[PDB]
Amino acid sequence: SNLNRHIRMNFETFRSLPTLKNSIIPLVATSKNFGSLCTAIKSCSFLDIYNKNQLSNNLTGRLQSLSDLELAILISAARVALRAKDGSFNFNLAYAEYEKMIKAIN
Amino acid sequence: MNVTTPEVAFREYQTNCLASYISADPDITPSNLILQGYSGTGKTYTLKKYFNANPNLHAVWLEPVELVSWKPLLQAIARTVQYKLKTLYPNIPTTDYDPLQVEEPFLLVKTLHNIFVQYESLQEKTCLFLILDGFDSLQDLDAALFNKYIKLNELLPKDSKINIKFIYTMLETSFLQRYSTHCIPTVMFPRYNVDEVSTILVMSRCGELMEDSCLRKRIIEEDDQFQNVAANFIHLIVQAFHSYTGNDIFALNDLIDFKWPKYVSRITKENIFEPLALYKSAIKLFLSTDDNLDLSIISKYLLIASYICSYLEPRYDASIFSRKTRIIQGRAAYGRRKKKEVNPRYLQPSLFAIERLLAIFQAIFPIALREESLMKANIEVFQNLSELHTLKLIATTMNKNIDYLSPKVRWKVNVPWEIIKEISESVHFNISDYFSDIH
Amino acid sequence: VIRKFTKKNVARAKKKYTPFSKRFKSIAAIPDLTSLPEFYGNRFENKLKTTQKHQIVETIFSKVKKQLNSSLPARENEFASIYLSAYSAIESDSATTIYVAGTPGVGKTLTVREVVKELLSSSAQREIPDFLYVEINGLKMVKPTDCYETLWNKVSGERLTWAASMESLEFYFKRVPKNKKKTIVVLLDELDAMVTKSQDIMYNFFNWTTYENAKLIVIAVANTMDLPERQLGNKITSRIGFTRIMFTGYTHEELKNIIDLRLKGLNDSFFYVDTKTGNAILIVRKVRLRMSADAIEIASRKVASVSGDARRALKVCKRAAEIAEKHYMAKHGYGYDGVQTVHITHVMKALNETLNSHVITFMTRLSFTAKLFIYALLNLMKKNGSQEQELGDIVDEIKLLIEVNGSNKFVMEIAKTLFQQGSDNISEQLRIISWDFVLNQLLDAGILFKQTMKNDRICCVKLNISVEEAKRAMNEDETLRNL
DNA sequence: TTTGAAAAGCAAGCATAAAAGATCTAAACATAAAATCTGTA
Ligand SMILES: Nc1ncnc2c1ncn2[C@@H]1O[C@H](COP(=O)(O)OP(=O)(O)OP(=O)(O)O)[C@@H](O)[C@H]1O
Ligand SMILES: Nc1ncnc2c1ncn2[C@@H]1O[C@H](COP(=O)(O)OP(=O)(O)OP(=O)(O)O)[C@@H](O)[C@H]1O
Ligand SMILES: [Mg+2]
Numbered sequence A: 001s002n003l004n005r006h007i008r009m010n011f012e013t014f015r016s017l018p019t020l021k022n023s024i025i026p027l028v029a030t031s032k033n034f035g036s037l038c039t040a041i042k043s044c045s046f047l048d049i050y051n052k053n054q055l056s057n058n059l060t061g062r063l064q065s066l067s068d069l070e071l072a073i074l075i076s077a078a079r080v081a082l083r084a085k086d087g088s089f090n091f092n093l094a095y096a097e098y099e100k101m102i103k104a105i106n
Numbered sequence B: 001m002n003v004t005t006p007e008v009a010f011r012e013y014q015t016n017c018l019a020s021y022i023s024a025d026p027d028i029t030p031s032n033l034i035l036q037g038y039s040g041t042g043k044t045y046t047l048k049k050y051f052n053a054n055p056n057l058h059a060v061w062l063e064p065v066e067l068v069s070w071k072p073l074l075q076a077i078a079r080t081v082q083y084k085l086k087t088l089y090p091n092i093p094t095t096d097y098d099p100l101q102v103e104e105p106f107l108l109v110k111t112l113h114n115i116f117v118q119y120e121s122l123q124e125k126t127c128l129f130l131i132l133d134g135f136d137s138l139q140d141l142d143a144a145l146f147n148k149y150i151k152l153n154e155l156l157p158k159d160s161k162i163n164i165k166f167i168y169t170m171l172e173t174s175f176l177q178r179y180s181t182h183c184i185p186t187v188m189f190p191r192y193n194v195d196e197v198s199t200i201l202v203m204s205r206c207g208e209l210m211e212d213s214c215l216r217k218r219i220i221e222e223d224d225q226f227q228n229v230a231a232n233f234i235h236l237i238v239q240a241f242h243s244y245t246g247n248d249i250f251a252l253n254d255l256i257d258f259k260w261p262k263y264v265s266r267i268t269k270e271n272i273f274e275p276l277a278l279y280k281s282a283i284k285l286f287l288s289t290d291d292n293l294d295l296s297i298i299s300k301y302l303l304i305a306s307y308i309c310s311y312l313e314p315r316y317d318a319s320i321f322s323r324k325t326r327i328i329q330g331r332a333a334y335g336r337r338k339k340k341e342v343n344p345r346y347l348q349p350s351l352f353a354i355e356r357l358l359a360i361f362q363a364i365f366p367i368a369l370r371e372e373s374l375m376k377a378n379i380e381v382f383q384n385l386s387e388l389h390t391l392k393l394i395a396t397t398m399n400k401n402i403d404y405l406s407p408k409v410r411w412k413v414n415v416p417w418e419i420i421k422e423i424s425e426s427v428h429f430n431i432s433d434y435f436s437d438i439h
Numbered sequence C: 001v002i003r004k005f006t007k008k009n010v011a012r013a014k015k016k017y018t019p020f021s022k023r024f025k026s027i028a029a030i031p032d033l034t035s036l037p038e039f040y041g042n043r044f045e046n047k048l049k050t051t052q053k054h055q056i057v058e059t060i061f062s063k064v065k066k067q068l069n070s071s072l073p074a075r076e077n078e079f080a081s082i083y084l085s086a087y088s089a090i091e092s093d094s095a096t097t098i099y100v101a102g103t104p105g106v107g108k109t110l111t112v113r114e115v116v117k118e119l120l121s122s123s124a125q126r127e128i129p130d131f132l133y134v135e136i137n138g139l140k141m142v143k144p145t146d147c148y149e150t151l152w153n154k155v156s157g158e159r160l161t162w163a164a165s166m167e168s169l170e171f172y173f174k175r176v177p178k179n180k181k182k183t184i185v186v187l188l189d190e191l192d193a194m195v196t197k198s199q200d201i202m203y204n205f206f207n208w209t210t211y212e213n214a215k216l217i218v219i220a221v222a223n224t225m226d227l228p229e230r231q232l233g234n235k236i237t238s239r240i241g242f243t244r245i246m247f248t249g250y251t252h253e254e255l256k257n258i259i260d261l262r263l264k265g266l267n268d269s270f271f272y273v274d275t276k277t278g279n280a281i282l283i284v285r286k287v288r289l290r291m292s293a294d295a296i297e298i299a300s301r302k303v304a305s306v307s308g309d310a311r312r313a314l315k316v317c318k319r320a321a322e323i324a325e326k327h328y329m330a331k332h333g334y335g336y337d338g339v340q341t342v343h344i345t346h347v348m349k350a351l352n353e354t355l356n357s358h359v360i361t362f363m364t365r366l367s368f369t370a371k372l373f374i375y376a377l378l379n380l381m382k383k384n385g386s387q388e389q390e391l392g393d394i395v396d397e398i399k400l401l402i403e404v405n406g407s408n409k410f411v412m413e414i415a416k417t418l419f420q421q422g423s424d425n426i427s428e429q430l431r432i433i434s435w436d437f438v439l440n441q442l443l444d445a446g447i448l449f450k451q452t453m454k455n456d457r458i459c460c461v462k463l464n465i466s467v468e469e470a471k472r473a474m475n476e477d478e479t480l481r482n483l
Numbered sequence D: 001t002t003t004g005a006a007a008a009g010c011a012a013g014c015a016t017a018a019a020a021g022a023t024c025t026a027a028a029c030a031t032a033a034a035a036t037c038t039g040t041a
């Protein structure tokens, strides 16, 4: 079942019953009738929606909110930092790398 | 759970979570609830929508950014909780407590206990929602502060008729991830995409734009049509400057406010039903952002010489500035052999001594038996240098309690290259010729 | 007026400021302080009292546990030395300092209190003159200067602030003649706690013993014999003196005698036990209680090996009695409302839980993500030997261990959970699921140390526990030791 | 017009000075309750 799968995933990652309870509570609370509650506990799709929301503001999820210019500046800063011995960079070096990539693309 | 879920666009999951967690019954309400999202993600807006759609809930609103430190926050909690309980139940005689007596977290526990024990005549148990909107925006924040607030409910009485419930809003993920083993229920507010940003901008701004005074004076100088004009302007602003702003509601609102009257002034009788002709009529509004707002000659040449002293190595100076006739046999410097690979003006400036700066200042300053046309370092030069340090255009290794006369103290320029470029253009000095041959 | 800040919770005592030197006009104006109704000692207990509505069932081991509580068979030479010094200095009306040092629980405070009790009995027989006993514990003081407030309040009955109390005590010990005085015996317990930076309190207390009119006995109980040499100056070390009394930790025979003295009337004795409830009466079944001499001997030998601390030996015996009483009450189902023996098994189980380590069995019961973190951390310590590893290197090495053992059954079932939480709608994540959770869990457990850094990648992490017990916990796991 | 060669420049290595800041304490600035002085009634 989906419930045992989510319990198993919590057992191997968090091993915490309050963590599971914090997901189970809005599954019960957002149900409007008994049939919706039984469908929600059989499918556990709200647990997937909850898990997606809990990861939405991390480094992976913040990257997908960036515009193309923001992504270009971040990529340029990252490759300057990778070329640096100590990983340090500033605005000038990142802008120089950025204009080198824009004229190399254009 | 008997509560109303308001319709908030693009925040339906967050509103359903707020309906799951925030209720008038203290038994099925968490003691702590966290809303986490970055700036402009509609956290405050949907909490406002939820509490206005449920007016029976008792919410107290606090702004930690207006309180700066922990002690004013404790005093604000005591003051606002006591005032809210006073206006909620006016038929309950209460002994007033001074919020300035709260100087410790323990004093807040004691004061809240004393405030809550004069309300046991109430029939039902009641949540009092204390909302700390912007907890991590507190200026004197440290890591130990939030632990006191999340353990505060364990020290209050358990059988009290009034039960405080904390709702926090946080901005940054790393601050929230410091406290993950506490297992506090959290609702995340991911950043909007560009279509949601455009829809929010239209539905929040087209009403104010279509009853603006400039448009209403322009239509008599030259409602759904005005709505389409304002909406097309908002969509053009988004497509022009979304790369510049990102998914920022505030920055796009500022750009709309800056560019709307200049767009209205280009509207003619020919331009209203032709959005393309109106767009080419106001092309310069959508090409650049336009979000922006007397030094002495000795001070200017001292700044130029300090920039040179910061960004040129002193071993080569004799190969640039030396121009005197050698009575004595002597070999000048050969000059640098290889160019630099990286432009040194991209890096932080290097430190120099006073006499090197005076040497380069004497070498670059503008101009017979009893003349000696070179300018020597008199008191006006040193006064200009002292003022230049006062304005932080030049800086030292030490920032406070500065021994100016110490030989250990070294000096650096503190201006960027564009500032020294405009300064050198004000006195017709060719500073770009000094860096052209070195990289 | 408008204040710049407020102090709204100021609680100030009713303590006067004028010292004792201005209490009378001259030295000759001072009366005989012994014939004064406030000098030398001339209400909260009932609030913790209630009425009992039941009948507590005291089982047969409850008397053993009660007699094993902390509330002089092995201290004869120490008792005789302290008592002889104090008797000689009291009866001849002189001032002296006695120094006592030792490890915790070796009977220092008990021996000094017994000496003071015997001296009070001798002063009640008119063999030595009367004296006042004052007990100042430096760990029971809020501020170290409050000892000045305490001692003077014990002498005069007044309540002064600490500086005025210090001047009052100085004037009293130096100027008041011996015919108008009483002898004072002061026990300075936890003497290291009254040591401050300026050491004025230590100098004053040991310098008042050098005054001719003082009639003051200072018994200073310390924890180390070299406290004046390590922490004090030469002036206070000269005043304390060369004679110092060391309280050695007890040997196992004296611990054996201490435990037998607490159980002289209970051991090998008969009780009337009521089988309906469990309540036992010391002289319905006649049950003999017994605690083994081998059990007491092995507990005493263990304790004398560790510290020679009588508190530990009494606590080990009480824990063994508690374990046996728990098993007895479980097997009879008695509640709280022919031979009962506390055996060497209970003594060994009491001695083992204090010597058992939970760190290894804590680490073997963690989730797979926390164990994977610890395993990757140990792998990085094996690779470069730095003993501090950056968290980004741990992230990269966890990712490497996942993609290298990808054909493993457990790993190829765990990868979707680790990087997507078993969901197709969740993007591949840069950290594993529960990365922050297991990091903070290992930090709160004290297994891990983390530097205070804001960049998450270059932040270093260190093992706080020993490396080999972490390796033992890692080799306990089935999956990690196979890859 | 050549010469060549001694001065100038490059560069790896390494001891060492110094920048930055973490941590802390003294001192100026500030408030306050109980006790004690002080000029009258
Ligand atoms: N879902 C929405 N529907 C309509 N308008 C919205 C929505 N979300 C945000 N807005 C508009 O954007 C404004 C900014 O949002 P809001 O103040 O709630 O952001 P926030 O996440 O609380 O920001 P901050 O952390 O800076 O305080 C709101 O005042 C509102 O006008
Ligand atoms: N000789 C003894 N005979 C009987 N009981 C003893 C004896 N010595 C110690 N004890 C028991 O051990 C307890 C601890 O003794 P005491 O308080 O004198 O120790 P201490 O040396 O002052 O320790 P600490 O430095 O921890 O204060 C006593 O209260 C008593 O119950
Ligand atoms: Mg807000």
Ligand SMILES: [Mg+2]
Pocket: C108, C109, C189
């Ligand atoms: Mg003691």
